RNA sequence: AUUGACAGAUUGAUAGCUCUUUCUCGAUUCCGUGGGUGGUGGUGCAUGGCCGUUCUUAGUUGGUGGAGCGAUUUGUCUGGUUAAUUCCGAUAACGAACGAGACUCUGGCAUGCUAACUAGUUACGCGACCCCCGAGCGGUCGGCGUCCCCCAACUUCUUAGAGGGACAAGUGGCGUUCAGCCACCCGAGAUUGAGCAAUAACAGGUCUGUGAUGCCCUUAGAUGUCCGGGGCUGCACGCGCGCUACACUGACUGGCUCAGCGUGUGCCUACCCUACGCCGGCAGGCGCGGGUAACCCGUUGAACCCCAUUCGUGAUGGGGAUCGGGGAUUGCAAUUAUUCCCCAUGAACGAGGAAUUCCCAGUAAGUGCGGGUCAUAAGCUUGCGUUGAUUAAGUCCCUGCCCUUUGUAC
């Protein structure tokens, strides 16, 4: 019971997930995006990012 | 009609108090955002709502690991029956438009 | 309370919020004729304009669905009570909206009208609406189980350049 | 009270931000006092480079998603009522306005 | 070894000279501003090119048709 | 009324500003004379303009120079351009134009760099390689 | 004549000799044994190095003030052979810088400034700028 | 009904998991059936989306007309021209669409304009402080650090606005005296470098990015899920991108001295950048401060370079693998060495066979520093500057690609 989630989930790629897909690989952590790199590409336009160069 | 009574019944009342209710799809939250009377966590909340939906007394939308439970009229009538509430009640949709 | 987060980070977070809300509105008001959100913050208030065709449907009965959506938005994004308001505006020339038309086609396909004919009609509608031109692509398993693609096209179109950014509404 | 009020217009768009800046200067000239012209700060470039590929197995090609961000701050020597009248006008775009009281 | 004019230049210059032969002259920077006035040329570079071909046609006109 | 002229030289990212003034012709960079700066093999460079035009042309014009950015060589090429440019700008304004023209001619025939700044600037790297133009090695087999 | 008018290399030699002749610095116990920074394969070959770098710190302080220990480590930084891996920066030894700065403090060359970090003092400005004048009056070379 | 339990045996476990033995929500349950639900299970040869590639070259398309029984063809071309199906010009075609070009960002020119305490200040004024700071008998100068605000003066440097700015526009040739090419003047000489990028494809990759997803499988002794441990790092061997080198155009030890993109806490789940002061040889430790940032880090005092060192062609002080002993930090935990520091050890390697990669201008190469991942953190990557070559300015020989004619049993 008390040991069900009892493993240090404070740091490293166990803890941090994406805020959209929720898979825990290739997170754009920079500028607090915290989203899958594929997800980022998906939404980028809405976020305000734009490919100029 | 299930589980710890105090938790479940508090969920139902919060769902009635507002028209809607939300969660986050995150099993491990010994608190729940909003609510927070005593643990009454994510799950219990989330599993109640899924039970509601199955019997057809609430609707759904998911969007970015988060859940959005809009409540039905038949659902409202189920909740009022459960909580032996008066016929006036006013859930949430009263709101003066103009 | 007294945070004042980074000018860098804040703008990123704002766009992220805007994008999540766009998804949720797309997911919720799909069938209902959703055509975008146009948010703007103000002193002690955050107006958020829903753009759609069937405005009566998005509002609901007597004022209902809009109120449910405001409450849900309040609950989700950490907004005070009366710090946010959903304003449904009717889309001018719904034909020239691409995402509205892509929805209309999705609906038609779900109903069971032929893959061609629904897509052809939609194309004819957007050209009557007064476009420079169009390009409508349906793809996947169009009869049998070996994936093909339709590609109904007309008029003046562009792919290259910067101008594509603001001259073609894509969906 | 008269005090050294500071407006700070930050935005993602340039044209919209400059238009707002111009309108605030016009409003300051109308209700004459002072200005200390709109100070262009060095624009930042919020940049993300990612792989175009989902998965690993194309030729390795990269996106370079930019996001520019501009700050025009404007000094002013006035009372509060005039500032509220000015700053209430020039809204609808994404221009974030931050009005500081005095000095810092 | 490079800069040939596209038809989007050439057509615009010919059309300019067909309507405004009188305004246009040999000196490039005069008629560079004429091209601005009489025609809605969206970009600066394109304008600048058109005028360059306009000058070149003027020179051809000043020496038979 | 004083005769002040503040003129800049450039090379990659080296903004050397030489400042001429009605003086006795010291000519010092940041806070020190032209006999240090201290890449030293390139001393004749930062001397060149003075050596070409002589002390007679400089004579009555003291020049304080300030430099920042770039690397050692780029800074020298900046100051060398700047002090010569400044001298020309002084002669334009507070002497006579025929004298300036003569100085300009004497400089250019030596090197056009003394007045005209190179546009050359560091080219940007593109993915798929360690530099701008070079690519990462291909494996093939 | 100031210190900037002198070729900084032959300045620090003369300052070091000055600091030896004075003989009231406070060279600590280690000097012989110590490495000098995590950079280095070896210790200094010049066995009375402390005097030399003390001089070098002082002259740095004259040129740029407000220099803390961290700032003194940064200036005495360099390449770090990882050997089989590629090279990187490494900041110089803190303690030696701190001992040098405390030694100069006892001399009354320097004084810890307001807003943190060392600056050299008038009585220090004396010695630095005196020996500059000595170097200038060595010979015309 | 039959959810949830201190023992003690057992157990890795302080898993009420079990056997034992007291009690509990009290309407939860257990059993079917329908049926869900989950799945980094299978299937990319069931699909979507997204990439990649063919294919970075100049290519692709329909309407109407003409030619053919027709598949088709013409348009979309003999010729010149161009980077270009770019133009000029020819003409059973006519008049169009995409692509290319234009376009967007960037680079470099503006003593022009608008601009400033979060730029400089800029030169003044030196109002000075300031001590002999120095020159100098003393005045006047040289130099900074700064103490500076504002009722000093502005925009040369600075930031970034909107303008201008080059067009093949001038002169000379060459060219049907068209399209254009070459040179030279003025001055950036059409060419700074990216971004975007057609038709039709491929049964390219991706179901392990998605609450995009069909079907199939599995579904309580679970392929669900969580906890402990291990593994993905195992070494007769073979290949691929890399780093370090083989030295004296060097190594070491001092000294001197110049950057540019960035990034940064008070967070989506627990923590940033760090100045200054002491303690520690060193990694590091302890104090106090500044910083949601042109404000603090930060004149980011980078490396190579430069200038004095010694060393002397010896597997040498080149090289720094392997390995012994100790010490630090990160962490819940570091043994199969997490990283870092120290002492010690001191391998092959004396420039690499057949092969084959990449590149033409601030490029190659050297050289460091940012960003990414990141508690801990780059031999990778993606950016940044700093130093700065040789050689080309062409050709189809190889390898390929584009058009035309041609042959073809594909």
Curated annotation (Swiss-Prot), chain C:
The superkingdom of the source organism is Eukaryota
Gene Ontology BP annotations? apoptotic process; cell division; DNA repair; positive regulation of apoptotic signaling pathway; regulation of translation; translation
Positions of post-translational N-acetylalanine modification = 2
Specify the protein's topology with respect to the membrane.
Peripheral membrane protein
Q: Any idea which residues bear Phosphoserine here?
A: 6, 35, 104
The protein's annotated catalytic reaction(s) are: 2'-deoxyribonucleotide-(2'-deoxyribose 5'-phosphate)-2'-deoxyribonucleotide-DNA = a 3'-end 2'-deoxyribonucleotide-(2,3-dehydro-2,3-deoxyribose 5'-phosphate)-DNA + a 5'-end 5'-phospho-2'-deoxyribonucleoside-DNA + H(+)
Phosphothreonine, modified sites: 42, 70
Where does the record say this protein resides? Cytoplasm; Nucleus; Nucleus, Nucleolus; Mitochondrion inner membrane
Record entry for activity regulation? Endonuclease activity is inhibited by MgCl2 on apurinic/apyrimidinic DNA but not on UV-irradiated DNA.
Q: Which residues carry this modification: N6-succinyllysine?
A: 132
Q: Under the cellular component aspect of Gene Ontology, which terms does the record hold?
A: cytosolic ribosome; cytosolic small ribosomal subunit; mitochondrial inner membrane; nucleolus; spindle
Q: Which residues form the KH type-2 domain?
A: 21-92
Residue positions of the PTM N6-acetyllysine? 62
Which keywords, in A-to-Z order, does the entry hold? Acetylation, Apoptosis, Cell cycle, Cell division, Cytoplasm, Cytoskeleton, DNA damage, DNA repair, DNA-binding, Isopeptide bond, Lyase, Membrane, Methylation, Mitochondrion, Mitochondrion inner membrane, Mitosis, Nucleus, Phosphoprotein, Ribonucleoprotein, Ribosomal protein, RNA-binding, Transcription, Transcription regulation, Translation regulation, Ubl conjugation
Q: Which GO terms describe its molecular function?
A: class I DNA-(apurinic or apyrimidinic site) endonuclease activity; DNA binding; RNA binding; structural constituent of ribosome
> According to the UniProt entry, which residues carry Asymmetric dimethylarginine?
64-65, 67
> How would you classify this enzyme at the top EC level?
lyase
Task: Please state the Enzyme Commission number of this protein.
Answer: 4.2.99.18
Query: Cross-link of type Glycyl lysine isopeptide (Lys-Gly) (interchain with G-Cter in ubiquitin): positions?
Result: 90
Protein name as it appears in the record:
Small ribosomal subunit protein uS3
Point out the gene that encodes the protein. RPS3
From Swiss-Prot, chain D:
Tell me where in or outside the cell this protein is found. Answer: Cytoplasm
Give the SUPFAM superfamilies listed for this entry. Answer: Ribosomal protein S10
A GO BP entry: translation
Give the matching InterPro entries. Answer: Ribosomal_uS10, Ribosomal_uS10_CS, Ribosomal_uS10_dom, Ribosomal_uS10_dom_sf, Ribosomal_uS10_euk/arc
Q: What's in the keyword line of the UniProt record?
A: Acetylation, Cytoplasm, Isopeptide bond, Phosphoprotein, Ribonucleoprotein, Ribosomal protein, Ubl conjugation
GO molecular-function annotation terms?
Answer: RNA binding; structural constituent of ribosome
Q: Which GO terms describe its cellular component?
A: cytosolic ribosome; small ribosomal subunit
Modification sites for Phosphoserine = 78
Posttranslational modification, per the record?
Polyubiquitinated by ZNF598 via 'Lys-63'-linked ubiquitin chains when a ribosome has stalled, initiating the ribosome quality control (RQC) pathway to degrade the potentially detrimental aberrant nascent polypeptide. Deubiquitinated by OTUD3 and USP21, antagonizing ZNF598 activity.
* Gene3D superfamilies for this protein: Ribosomal protein S10 domain
Q: What is the purpose of this protein?
A: Component of the small ribosomal subunit. The ribosome is a large ribonucleoprotein complex responsible for the synthesis of proteins in the cell.
Assembly and partners are described as:
Component of the 40S small ribosomal subunit.
Query: What HAMAP family does UniProt report for this protein, alphabetically?
Result: Ribosomal_uS10
Name this polypeptide is given: Small ribosomal subunit protein uS10
Q: Which organism is it from?
A: Oryctolagus cuniculus
Swiss-Prot record, chain F:
One record GO biological process: maturation of SSU-rRNA from tricistronic rRNA transcript (SSU-rRNA, 5.8S rRNA, LSU-rRNA)
Q: Which PROSITE patterns match?
A: RIBOSOMAL_S9
N6-acetyllysine PTM positions read 55
Q: Where does it live in the cell?
A: Cytoplasm; Nucleus, Nucleolus
Which molecular function terms from Gene Ontology are attached?
Answer: RNA binding; structural constituent of ribosome
Q: Which GO terms describe its cellular component?
A: cytosolic ribosome; cytosolic small ribosomal subunit; nucleolus
What does the UniProt keyword field contain?
A: Acetylation, Cytoplasm, Nucleus, Phosphoprotein, Ribonucleoprotein, Ribosomal protein
Membership in a protein family: Belongs to the universal ribosomal protein uS9 family.
**Tell me, what does this protein do in biology?**
Component of the small ribosomal subunit. The ribosome is a large ribonucleoprotein complex responsible for the synthesis of proteins in the cell. Part of the small subunit (SSU) processome, first precursor of the small eukaryotic ribosomal subunit. During the assembly of the SSU processome in the nucleolus, many ribosome biogenesis factors, an RNA chaperone and ribosomal proteins associate with the nascent pre-rRNA and work in concert to generate RNA folding, modifications, rearrangements and cleavage as well as targeted degradation of pre-ribosomal RNA by the RNA exosome.
Assembly and partners are described as: Component of the small ribosomal subunit. Part of the small subunit (SSU) processome, composed of more than 70 proteins and the RNA chaperone small nucleolar RNA (snoRNA) U3.
Q: What name is this protein filed under?
A: Small ribosomal subunit protein uS9
Tell me what organism the protein belongs to. Answer: Oryctolagus cuniculus (Rabbit)
Curated annotation (Swiss-Prot), chain G:
Name the Gene Ontology biological process terms: ribosomal small subunit assembly; translation
Q: Where is the protein localized? A: Cytoplasm; Nucleus, Nucleolus
> Which residues pair up as cystines?
none
GO cellular component: a single term: nucleolus
Q: Which GO terms describe its molecular function?
A: RNA binding; structural constituent of ribosome
Q: What does this protein do?
A: Component of the small ribosomal subunit. The ribosome is a large ribonucleoprotein complex responsible for the synthesis of proteins in the cell. Required for pre-rRNA processing and maturation of 40S ribosomal subunits. Part of the small subunit (SSU) processome, first precursor of the small eukaryotic ribosomal subunit.
Lineage top rank: taxon: Eukaryota
Check the record and name the InterPro entries matching this protein: Ribosomal_eS19 (IPR001266), Ribosomal_eS19_CS (IPR018277), WH-like_DNA-bd_sf (IPR036388), WH_DNA-bd_sf (IPR036390)
Q: By its UniProt entry, which Gene3D superfamilies does this protein fall under?
A: Winged helix-like DNA-binding domain superfamily/Winged helix DNA-binding domain
Report the PROSITE patterns cross-referenced here: RIBOSOMAL_S19E (PS00628)
**PTM-bearing positions, type Omega-N-methylarginine:** 64
Similarity comment: Belongs to the eukaryotic ribosomal protein eS19 family.
| Protein name according to UniProt | Small ribosomal subunit protein eS19
Sites of N6-acetyllysine modification: 20, 108, 112
Q: How does it assemble?
A: Component of the small ribosomal subunit. Part of the small subunit (SSU) processome, composed of more than 70 proteins and the RNA chaperone small nucleolar RNA (snoRNA) U3. Interacts with RPS19BP1; the interaction is direct and mediates the integration of RPS19 in state post-A1. Interacts with RPS19BP1.
Which positions bear N6-succinyllysine? Answer: 140
Source species, please?
A: Oryctolagus cuniculus (Rabbit)
Keywords, A to Z, come to:
Acetylation, Cytoplasm, Host-virus interaction, Methylation, Nucleus, Ribonucleoprotein, Ribosomal protein
């Amino acid at each position: 019971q008390q040991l069900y989630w009892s493993h240090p989930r404070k740091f490293g790629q166990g803890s941090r997930s994406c805020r959209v897909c929720s898979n825990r690989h290739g997170l754009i952590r920079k500028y607090g995006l915290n989203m899958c790199r594929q997800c980022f590409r998906q939404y980028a336009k809405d976020i305000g990012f734009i490919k100029l160069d | 009609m299930l589980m710890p009574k105090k938790n479940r019944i508090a969920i139902y009342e919060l769902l009635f108090k507002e028209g809607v209710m939300v969660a986050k799809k995150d099993v491990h939250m010994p608190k729940h955002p909003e609510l927070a009377d005593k643990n009454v966590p994510n799950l219990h909340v989330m599993k109640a709502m899924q039970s509601l939906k199955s019997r057809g007394y609430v609707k759904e939308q998911f969007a970015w690991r988060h859940f959005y439970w809009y409540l039905t009229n038949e659902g409202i009538q189920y909740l009022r029956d459960y909580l032996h509430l008066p016929p006036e009640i006013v859930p949430a949709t009263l709101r003066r438009s103009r | 309370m007294a945070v004042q987060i980074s000018k860098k980070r804040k703008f990123v977070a704002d766009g992220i919020f805007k994008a999540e809300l766009n998804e949720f509105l797309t997911r919720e008001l799909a069938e209902d004729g959703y055509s975008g959100v146009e948010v703007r913050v103000t002193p002690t208030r955050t107006e958020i304009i829903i753009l759609a065709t069937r405005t009566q449907n998005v509002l609901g009965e007597k004022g209902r669905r809009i109120r449910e959506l405001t409450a849900v938005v309040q609950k989700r994004f950490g907004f005070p009570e009366g710090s946010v308001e959903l304003y449904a505006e009717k889309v001018a020339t719904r034909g020239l909206c691409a995402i509205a038309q892509a929805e209309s086609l999705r609906y038609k396909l779900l109903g069971g009208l032929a893959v061609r004919r629904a897509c052809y009609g939609v194309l004819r509608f957007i050209m009557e609406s007064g476009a420079k031109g169009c390009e409508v692509v349906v793809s996947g398993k169009l009869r049998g189980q070996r994936a093909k693609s339709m590609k109904f096209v007309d008029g003046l179109m562009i792919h290259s350049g910067d101008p594509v950014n603001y001259y073609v509404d894509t969906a | 009270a008269i005090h050294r009020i500071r407006i700070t217009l930050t935005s993602r768009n340039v044209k919209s931000l400059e238009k707002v800046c111009a309108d605030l200067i016009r409003g300051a000239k109308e209700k004459n006092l002072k200005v200390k012209g709109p100070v262009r700060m060095p624009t930042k470039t919020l940049r993300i480079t990612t792989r175009k590929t989902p998965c690993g197995e194309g030729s390795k090609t990269w996106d370079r998603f930019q996001m520019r961000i501009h700050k025009r701050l404007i000094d002013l020597h006035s009372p509060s009522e005039i500032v509220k009248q000015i700053t209430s006008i020039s809204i609808e775009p994404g221009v974030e306005v931050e009005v500081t009281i005095a000095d810092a | 070894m490079g800069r040939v004019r596209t038809k989007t230049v050439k057509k615009a210059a010919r059309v300019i000279i067909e309507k405004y032969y009188t305004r246009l002259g040999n000196d490039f920077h005069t008629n560079k501003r004429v091209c601005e006035e009489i025609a809605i040329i969206p970009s600066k570079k394109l304008r600048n090119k058109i005028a360059g071909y306009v000058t070149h046609l003027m020179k051809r006109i000043q020496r038979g048709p | 009324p004083l005769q002040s002229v503040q003129v800049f030289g450039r090379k990659k990212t080296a903004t050397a500003v030489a400042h001429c003034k009605r003086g006795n012709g010291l000519i010092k960079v940041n806070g020190r004379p032209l006999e240090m700066i201290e890449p030293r093999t390139l001393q004749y460079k930062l001397l060149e303009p003075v050596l070409l035009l002589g002390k007679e042309r400089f004579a009555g014009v003291d020049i304080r120079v300030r430099v920042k950015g770039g690397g050692h060589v780029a800074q020298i090429y900046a100051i060398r351009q700047s002090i010569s440019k400044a001298l020309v700008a002084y002669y334009q304004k507070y002497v006579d134009e025929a004298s300036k023209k003569e100085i300009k001619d004497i400089l250019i025939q030596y090197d056009r760099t003394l007045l005209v700044a190179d546009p050359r600037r560091c080219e940007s790297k593109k993915f798929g390689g360690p530099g701008a133009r070079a690519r990462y090695q291909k494996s093939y087999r | 004549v100031t210190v900037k008018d002198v070729n900084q290399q032959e300045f620090v030699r003369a300052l070091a000799a000055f600091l030896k002749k004075s003989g009231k610095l406070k060279v600590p116990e280690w000097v012989d044994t110590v490495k000098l920074a995590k950079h280095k394969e070896l210790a200094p070959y010049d066995e009375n190095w402390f005097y030399t770098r003390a001089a070098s710190t002082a002259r740095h302080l004259y040129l740029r003030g407000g220099a803390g220990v961290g700032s003194m480590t940064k200036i005495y930084g360099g390449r770090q052979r990882n050997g089989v891996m590629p090279s990187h920066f490494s900041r110089g030894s803190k303690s030696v810088a701190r001992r040098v700065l405390q030694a100069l403090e006892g001399l009354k060359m320097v004084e810890k400034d307001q807003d943190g970090g060392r600056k050299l003092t008038p009585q220090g400005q004396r010695d630095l700028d005196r020996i500059a004048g000595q170097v200038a009056a060595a010979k015309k070379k």
